[PDB]
């Protein structure tokens, strides 16, 4: 697993447990 609970393409990482929508407009490096 690369993110907590992704639904699109969040740039954030599992190592901090983002568990949300940190930047739907970004989509850069999921």
């Amino acid at each position: 697993g690369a993110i907590c609970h992704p639904v699109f393409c969040p740039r954030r990482y599992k190592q901090i447990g983002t568990c949300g929508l940190p930047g739907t407009k970004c989509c850069k490096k999921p």
Side-chain angles (χ1 to χ4, degrees), residues 2-16:
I3 316 95
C4 176
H5 193 242
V7 201
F8 54 101
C9 47
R11 188 181 180 192
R12 282 298 206 173
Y13 318 94
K14 64 103 70 180
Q15 77 198 61
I16 59 146

Side-chain angles (χ1 to χ4, degrees), residues 8-13 21-30:
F8 54 101
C9 47
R11 188 181 180 192
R12 282 298 206 173
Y13 318 94
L21 54 142
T24 316
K25 62 234 292 283
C26 300
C27 203
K28 194 191 191 297
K29 191 75 100 180

